[PDB]
Curated annotation (Swiss-Prot):
The active site is at K139. This is Transaldolase. It catalyses: D-sedoheptulose 7-phosphate + D-glyceraldehyde 3-phosphate = D-erythrose 4-phosphate + beta-D-fructose 6-phosphate. Its EC number is 2.2.1.2. The keyword Transferase applies. GO terms for molecular function: transaldolase activity. Pfam families: TAL_FSA. Keywords: Cytoplasm, Pentose shunt, Schiff base, Transferase. The gene is tal. Its main location: cytoplasm. It is found in: Cytoplasm. GO terms for biological process: carbohydrate metabolic process; pentose-phosphate shunt. Transaldolase is important for the balance of metabolites in the pentose-phosphate pathway.
Length: 352
């Protein structure tokens, strides 16, 4: 039942909605979610493509914007920034109530910037200013250029959702970049206590890539095993003396955020990923059908740290089979970028 969201909060995990649209906010639905236990919102270009195509409240806004001398991208950004502003306003009471730890809304930069660190910084600073809300996160793909940009943006005091992570190694590189940016601010006497970063580590796409060729004892296990190992890495990195010296001065840890947590394979229970990944100081962003499945028949238990030995043993067998999860991660990141660019070009066409 609905109280499960609060039960998961008591276990230390925030549940965010992996959807955004003009009607979600305007209808009052988001506000009612923010009072039932939902704690934030994520978007991406595919989410906006679907929203723009299906939500009747965009029609008048597009007609208005087509009367102005604007590029398709600016028309999109005006629409998306307006949705994000409005959602931030709905989430602001939640955000302020925790000292700025919850109640975030994320907006992703253009996919074409993913390998351009300077361009990413420029667009992220611009979108941060355009939204003009303390609870907005700018969402940046975790390419090498994105990790470069993360350090700069953190040093600028901007909260970031670093996305398209599939790799434990790349996630550790992101933590190090974050820490460098925090250290910069502390050295300059600048605030750090409101800077929040999440590392959006993708789940279902790993199983989708591998399961058809895995042996039976591993089908549907790899993504969860990776996530459990990533969380062990997180505990080690953020408790170490190096980070503790920053946390003592007000720095926040990065948090892992489980993304792509809708189940794609009908052979697995629809709550598999949510049920399996609950642990303290994490986030899980879910699509609306998964949110409703979890409310209906999910389970709130601290599963993320259970049986880490088995997770390791499974990852050892994945390697034994010749699957290099680092090569896989790079391929999944590049393919996610291609898919997001396709979605973005698809949403821009009707805005010409």
């Amino acid at each position: 039942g609905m109280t499960i969201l609060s039960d998961v909060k008591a276990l230390g995990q925030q549940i965010w909605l992996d959807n955004l649209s003009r009607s979600l906010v305007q209808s009052g639905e988001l506000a009612q979610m923010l009072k039932q236990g939902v704690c934030g919102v994520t978007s991406n270009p595919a989410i906006f493509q679907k929203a723009f195509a299906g939500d009747a409240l965009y029609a008048d806004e597009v007609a208005a914007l087509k009367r102005q001398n604007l590029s398709p991208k600016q028309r999109y950004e005006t629409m998306a920034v307006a949705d994000v502003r409005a959602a931030c306003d709905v989430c602001l009471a939640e955000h302020e109530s925790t000292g700025g730890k919850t109640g975030f809304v994320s907006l992703e930069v253009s996919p074409e910037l993913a390998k351009d660190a300077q361009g990413t910084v420029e667009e992220a600073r611009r979108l941060h200013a355009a939204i003009a809300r303390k609870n907005a996160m700018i969402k940046v793909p975790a390419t090498d250029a994105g990790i470069d940009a993360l350090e700069t943006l953190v040093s600028d005091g901007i909260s970031v959702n670093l996305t398209l992570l599939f790799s434990r190694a790349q996630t550790l590189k992101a933590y190090a970049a974050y820490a460098r940016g925090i250290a910069k601010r502390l050295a300059a006497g600048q605030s750090v206590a409101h800077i929040q970063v999440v590392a959006s580590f993708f789940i279902s796409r790993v199983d989708s890539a591998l399961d058809a060729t895995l042996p039976d004892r591993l089908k549907g296990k790899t993504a969860i095993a990776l996530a459990k190992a990533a969380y062990q890495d997180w505990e080690q990195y953020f408790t170490a003396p190096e980070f503790a010296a920053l946390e003592a001065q007000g720095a926040n840890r990065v948090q892992l955020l489980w993304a792509s947590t809708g189940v794609k394979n009908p052979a697995y229970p629809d709550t598999l990923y949510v049920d399996s990944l609950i642990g303290v100081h994490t986030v899980n962003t879910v699509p609306d059908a998964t949110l409703k499945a979890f409310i209906d028949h999910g389970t709130a238990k601290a599963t993320l740290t259970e049986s880490a030995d088995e997770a390791r043993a499974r990852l050892a067998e994945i390697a034994a089979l010749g699957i290099d999860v680092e090569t896989l991660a790079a391929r999944l990141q590049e393919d996610g970028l291609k898919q997001f660019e396709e979605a973005f070009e698809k949403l821009l066409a009707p805005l010409v």
